[PDB]
Amino acid sequence: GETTDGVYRVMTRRLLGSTQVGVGVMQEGVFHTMWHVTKGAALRSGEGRLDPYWGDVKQDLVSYCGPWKLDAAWDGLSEVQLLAVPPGERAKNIQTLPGIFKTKDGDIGAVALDYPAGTSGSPILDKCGRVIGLYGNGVVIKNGSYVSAITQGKRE
Amino acid sequence: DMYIERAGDITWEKDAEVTGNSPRLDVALDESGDFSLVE
Ligand SMILES: CCn1cnc2ccccc21
């Protein structure tokens, strides 16, 4: 199937018509997405099959064909871009200054942008075009707005 | 049966639309990977 680096939609034909359940990143031959998008199922790419290789429900991440390859991190100061891929709509870059999720185990950058659930797995990038995490695991705050963590895995 | 379809390159775009605020929130992450607000 298609192994070219880039951002991809994750589709299913199990529901009505063809439905976009999420998004992912192909980098160095490995497909990266959030666990809640695929639930760890195998994926098809044309006539080819992508099998899960690593995953973790708590991190809400999964990699296919190989180990997690994305290791860039938000520098804690600069604006970033969400490369949003919404269902049925063209990929679009949105620039924003992240906020912060403060936890008992440390602080994480967060992006206050609200897209449909099927946009989960869209990449967040730095000024060098490096993926610093994936969008789509977050919280609903006081005024009812959605804020996503910038979720990044560990490159072994 | 899930399948993937290419949607684009991963590149920073100059003069992209700039929006979104930057909230600082106290959150908790449970064993199921769900975030919740801590008050
Ligand atoms: C409140 C749920 N929600 C809203 N927008 C989303 C985008 C990705 C994942 C979940 C989302």
Side-chain angles (χ1 to χ4, degrees), chain A residues 6-8 10 22-27 30-37 54 59-64 68-74 81-83 101 108-111 119-125 130-138 146-153, chain B residues 10 35:
Chain A
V7 62
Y8 287 64
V10 175
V23 179
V25 174
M26 184 78 70
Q27 181 173 129
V30 173
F31 190 66
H32 304 78
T33 187
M34 305 207 79
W35 184 88
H36 79 263
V37 168
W54 168 80
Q59 295 183 46
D60 192 24
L61 292 178
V62 59
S63 68
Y64 286 78
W68 184 272
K69 303 286 188 167
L70 314 179
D71 60 349
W74 181 41
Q81 286 186 1
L82 169 65
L83 180 43
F101 275 4
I108 315 172
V111 298
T119 313
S120 289
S122 290
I124 296 155
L125 340 171
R130 300 179 296 175
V131 173
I132 56 170
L134 306 184
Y135 168 81
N137 193 24
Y146 186 67
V147 181
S148 175
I150 295 180
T151 296
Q152 181 61 292
Chain B
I10 297 172
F35 280 108

Side-chain angles (χ1 to χ4, degrees), chain A residues 15-96:
Chain A
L15 277 9
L16 183 70
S18 301
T19 306
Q20 179 178 317
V21 293
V23 179
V25 174
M26 184 78 70
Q27 181 173 129
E28 291 160 61
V30 173
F31 190 66
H32 304 78
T33 187
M34 305 207 79
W35 184 88
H36 79 263
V37 168
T38 68
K39 307 300 200 294
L43 299 175
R44 181 166 41 84
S45 185
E47 259 198 339
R49 184 186 172 120
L50 302 203
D51 294 325
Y53 177 101
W54 168 80
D56 189 295
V57 158
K58 186 174 174 176
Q59 295 183 46
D60 192 24
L61 292 178
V62 59
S63 68
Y64 286 78
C65 317
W68 184 272
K69 303 286 188 167
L70 314 179
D71 60 349
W74 181 41
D75 67 6
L77 288 186
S78 310
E79 284 195 341
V80 307
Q81 286 186 1
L82 169 65
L83 180 43
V85 186
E89 301 178 349
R90 202 151 44 235
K92 172 184 57 258
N93 295 63
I94 313 285
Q95 193 164 316
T96 195

Side-chain angles (χ1 to χ4, degrees), chain A residues 2 5-9 11 13 18 44 58 81 83 93 95-102 112 125-126 137, chain B residues 1-13 16-19 21-27 33 35:
Chain A
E2 190 165 23
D5 277 10
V7 62
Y8 287 64
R9 303 177 191 275
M11 311 293 299
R13 301 220 177 112
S18 301
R44 181 166 41 84
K58 186 174 174 176
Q81 286 186 1
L83 180 43
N93 295 63
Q95 193 164 316
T96 195
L97 178 78
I100 307 291
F101 275 4
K102 302 174 188 190
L125 340 171
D126 63 25
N137 193 24
Chain B
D1 198 65
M2 295 183 177
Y3 62 99
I4 64 179
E5 300 184 329
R6 201 166 186 274
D9 287 7
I10 297 172
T11 296
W12 178 272
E13 117 144 87
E17 194 230 348
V18 185
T19 200
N21 71 301
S22 323
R24 292 180 194 261
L25 305 155
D26 281 348
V27 305
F35 280 108

